[PDB]
């Protein structure tokens, strides 16, 4: 029985190989009292007196001691399994620094004593869940957004683009614009409330300027949300202004281009002979791509950029929030994957030189 653990910036999904959905999904949050530590949903329930901190910021480890707490919470508190009795499949961000991968390998083999372990690129696993071997995966998670083109199973690192704009930036932007309506959220506890608001009432408009016009001359686009303490707040144009930062990073003062142009630019960096198939296999992944209407807006924007003769097809499966995890479960069940396993007895005699190879 193999374990699949996909460590994201905000959510850490864990489960067992061969399953269809993650058995354990909890926020990657370490909370400490401000009036000795709480991790995950136990921090989420007591966040009234806790100072919530994310151990991952922009896909970068800021505190490895908190990271071990997240992993300790997965094995013993959520999965309820012994890490030394199950092979564990890890997921890594594209262009993952070899220093970051080594620490992941070192912790798993020395602190948790796992028998077998393997690290896979999140973009590759996202394509397995869709049953494809060719296409560009735009995985937008909590910390960072990546565009990884893939052709016939071959990865092209030179065409991988990174956008420092993801779910956390949208959540912080929603708080900034919510004060324009009169609701003030400042503490880290209120960040989760705003994030909960973003996941329920936000959506991507097909056109932004027109959506401003109807929201400024009609009350059909307003929705009501209930706070934990009972006050009901209403939001109008903030529903689609927050996700618009994905396509217009200038709202956040950022100079880089939107996630539609980043996807197009990553294709433009590929060879000419493969661009046609990448246009027709644009795969969305991550929780930041779960906004209603994000697929239609993506298709309209990329079509305006791509030549008229190319068929833009945005693939947005309904379970794309767990595509990375689902792809990991399928890999951990394939018969051809057993030769990818890295043994503990192999690591202690060889070191991280064997994990830098046998991986990508």
């Amino acid at each position: 029985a193999a374990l699949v653990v996909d460590n994201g910036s905000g959510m850490c999904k864990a489960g067992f190989a061969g399953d269809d959905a993650p058995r354990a999904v909890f926020p990657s949050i370490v909370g400490r009292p401000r009036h000795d530590s709480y991790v995950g949903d136990e921090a989420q329930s007591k966040r009234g007196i806790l100072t919530l901190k994310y151990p991952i910021e922009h896909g970068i480890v800021t505190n490895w001691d908190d990271m071990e707490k997240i992993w300790h919470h997965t094995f013993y508190n959520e999965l309820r399994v012994a890490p030394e009795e199950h092979p564990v499949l890890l997921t890594e961000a594209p262009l993952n620094p070899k220093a970051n991968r080594e620490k992941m390998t070192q912790i798993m083999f020395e602190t948790f004593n796992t028998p077998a372990m393997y690290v896979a690129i999140q973009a590759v696993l996202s394509l397995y869940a869709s049953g494809r071997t060719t296409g560009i995966v735009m995985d937008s998670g909590d910390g960072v957004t990546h565009t990884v083109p893939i052709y016939e199973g071959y990865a092209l690192p030179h065409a991988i683009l990174r956008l420092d704009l993801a779910g956390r930036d949208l959540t912080d932007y929603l708080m900034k614009i919510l004060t324009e309506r009169g609701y003030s959220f400042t503490t880290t506890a209120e960040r989760e409330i705003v994030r909960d608001i973003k996941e329920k009432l936000c959506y991507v408009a097909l056109d932004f300027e027109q959506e401003m016009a109807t929201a400024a001359s009609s009350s059909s686009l307003e929705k009501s949300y209930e706070l934990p303490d009972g006050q009901v707040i209403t939001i109008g144009n903030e529903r689609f202004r927050c996700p618009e930062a994905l396509f217009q990073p200038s709202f956040l003062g950022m100079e880089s281009a939107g996630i539609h142009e980043t996807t197009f630019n990553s294709i433009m960096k590929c060879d000419v002979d493969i661009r046609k198939d990448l246009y027709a296999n644009t795969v969305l992944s991550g929780g930041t791509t779960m906004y209603p209407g994000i697929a239609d807006r993506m298709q309209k924007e990329i079509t305006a950029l791509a030549p008229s003769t190319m068929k833009i097809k945005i693939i947005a499966p309904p379970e794309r929030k767990y595509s990375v995890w689902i792809g990991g479960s399928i890999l951990a069940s394939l018969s051809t994957f057993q030769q990818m396993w890295i043994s503990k007895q192999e690591y202690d005699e060889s070191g991280p030189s064997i994990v830098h190879r046998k991986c990508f």
Partner: protein, 344 residues
């Protein structure tokens, strides 16, 4: 409203906290400025807004279950915002509308027709318009400090009093049951005054009494049954009521109800809806910034029986004339009903 304009219509029984997602009458594309219930139909309300239109709505007997955006009649005749709306006291389906374009229009909601157009009578902004007792005339308050009595059907100026109040602040004018004009305004020294005018002799007012030196326009509420005028100031925390009699000085201060919170709006319940058995002669709905607080005005009486003297016959919910009859030139008084049947 977040976009456009809307007003909340709820049954009187629905007290307590109101849901923030409660359905509202949101059909206007701009903020709604004035609303007024039909005196002959308890489920019909007209609304004027910034979108230069008047919308007449039909409210279900149990209220709103879903947001109401389609009105019965969309009544478009103004080039600027419409902030004044006044139903005809006795003519059925006859509505008055005055916009910021200084034009007064009398309409027919039943047929969506424009009965009369009065555009060359008000040279400046119109403050308020009030019908007379039988609906024959109306008085208007204009930015040029002038009070005008205008016959709508003939399009003539019956009378005019220039510089009714010397102040530059907004001033109001209402018609009394006897036919006199009651006006509130400001002096040259920015002192709030009340005035009583005789349409036959407009040289000087009978009464001119000053109240204070506060800001804000004074919204008068006249009760024809008791001849008591309630003066409510926007932003004031007090309500002053006066009695209008034929003896000098024709304006008699009764008392003042004082509170600790300023009012943002003000609403008066018509005579048909008061608790007749508790000697309640006026019920006022004081509008705070986030709350509506009813205020009960009662006459202290030892007897628990019905008070004939306090409660004469009042106008009912049935109309005397109709739109085509009033246009012809007929005049009639509103039909008086009896409040004795409401005693429990």
């Amino acid at each position: 409203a977040s976009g456009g304009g809307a007003f909340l219509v709820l049954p009187l029984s629905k007290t307590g906290r109101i849901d923030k997602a409660y359905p509202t009458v949101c059909g206007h594309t701009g903020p709604v400025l004035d609303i007024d219930w039909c005196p002959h139909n308890d489920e019909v309300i007209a609304s004027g807004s910034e979108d230069c239109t008047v919308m007449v709505w039909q409210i279900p007997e149990n209220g709103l279950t879903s947001p109401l955006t389609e009105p019965v009649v969309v009544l478009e005749g103004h080039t600027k915002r419409v902030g004044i709306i006044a139903w005809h006291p006795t003519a059925r389906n006859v509505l008055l509308s005055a916009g910021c374009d200084n034009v007064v229009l009398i309409w027919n909601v039943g047929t969506a027709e424009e009965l009369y157009r009065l555009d060359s009578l008000h040279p400046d902004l119109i403050y308020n318009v009030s019908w007379n007792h039988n609906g024959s005339l109306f008085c208007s308050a204009c930015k040029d400090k002038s009070v005008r009595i205008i016959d709508p059907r003939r399009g003539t100026l019956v009378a005019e009093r220039e510089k009714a109040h010397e102040g530059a602040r907004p001033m109001r004018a209402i018609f009394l049951a006897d036919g006199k004009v009651f006006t509130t305004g400001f002096s040259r020294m920015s002192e709030r005054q009340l005035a009583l005018w005789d349409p036959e002799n407009l040289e000087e007012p009978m009464a001119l009494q000053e109240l204070d030196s506060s800001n804000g326009a004074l919204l008068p509420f006249y009760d024809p049954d008791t001849s008591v005028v309630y003066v409510c100031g926007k932003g004031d925390s007090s309500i002053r009521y006066f009695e209008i009699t034929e003896e000098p000085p024709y304006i008699h201060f009764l008392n003042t109800f004082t509170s600790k919170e300023p009012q943002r709006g003000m609403g008066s319940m018509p005579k048909r809806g008061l608790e007749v058995s508790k000697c309640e002669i006026a019920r006022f709905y004081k509008l705070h910034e986030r709350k509506c607080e009813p205020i009960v005005m009662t006459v202290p009486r030892k007897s628990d029986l019905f008070q004939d003297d306090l409660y004469p016959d009042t106008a009912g919910p049935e109309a005397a004339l109709e739109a085509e009859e009033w246009v012809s030139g007929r005049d009639a008084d509103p039909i008086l009903i009896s409040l004795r049947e409401a005693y429990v």
